[PDB]
Each structure stands twice: as structure tokens, then as C-alpha cells.
Design a binder for this molecule. Structure first.
Ligand SMILES: *[C@@H]1O[C@H](CO)[C@@H](O)[C@H](O)[C@H]1NC(C)=O
Lengths: 50, 50
């Protein structure tokens, strides 16, 4: 009696590798926050009047 | 300061109050002038010098 792995084996199937799409996490990103846009002005009427 | 009370007469009273304050100056490109926290414009480059 001999084991099943003692004889050479050939794959009769046509392998098809399937790599699922990895999960992705999106982080917040802004070129200019609303605070930066407000600060872009040279003068602010609110602060000047205050 | 105001003048003392003298009947049916106009009087002029001068008041001089020296004031010194620390203000945050701001400037934008080409940086040829800058403003102050009080809203006053200064037509001189912040980097002007000899
Ligand atoms: C992936 O597919 C290939 C054939 O494209 C196959 O040879 C391989 O054994 C498969 N599995 C792994 C883990 O690479």
C-alpha cells in the first residue's frame, strides 16, 4: 500500500486567480478650509469695527 | 478735558491723550503695502529699509 502523494500529480483544472478589491478609506481633504478663505482677505470689516 | 463754566460764552478745551498699541499687520503680494489691525493702510513695503 502506498500513499496518495507518492505518485506525481498534474492539475487537470485551468486555474483562475480572483483578487477581491481591497477596502479603501477616504480621509477628509480640502485645498483651502473655510477659515483660510476668510483669512485670505487683507482686511475684515467685522474685526476692524470691533 | 473741557473748559470751566462761564455764562453766555463759548470756550475751547484741548485734550491730548498719547496712545500706543500693539497691532497685527497684514500684507499680500507684491507686499508693497500693509494694513494694521485698526484698518489703517500703510503705503510702504514691510521690508523697506536702507
Ligand atoms: C493564483 O493564480 C495562479 C495562476 O494565475 C496560480 O498559479 C496560483 O497558484 C494561484 N494562487 C496563488 C496563491 O498564487
Amino acid at each position: 500500500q502506498l500513499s496518495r502523494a507518492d505518485i506525481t500529480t498534474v492539475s487537470t483544472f485551468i486555474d483562475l486567480n480572483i483578487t477581491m478589491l481591497e477596502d479603501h478609506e477616504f480621509v477628509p481633504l480640502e485645498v483651502y478650509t473655510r477659515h483660510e478663505i476668510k483669512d485670505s482677505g487683507l482686511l475684515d470689516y467685522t474685526e476692524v469695527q470691533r | 478735558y473741557n473748559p470751566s463754566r462761564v455764562e453766555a460764552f463759548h470756550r475751547y478745551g484741548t485734550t491730548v491723550n498719547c496712545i500706543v498699541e500693539e497691532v497685527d499687520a497684514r500684507s499680500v503680494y507684491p507686499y508693497d503695502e500693509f494694513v494694521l489691525a485698526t484698518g489703517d493702510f500703510v503705503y510702504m513695503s514691510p521690508f523697506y529699509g536702507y
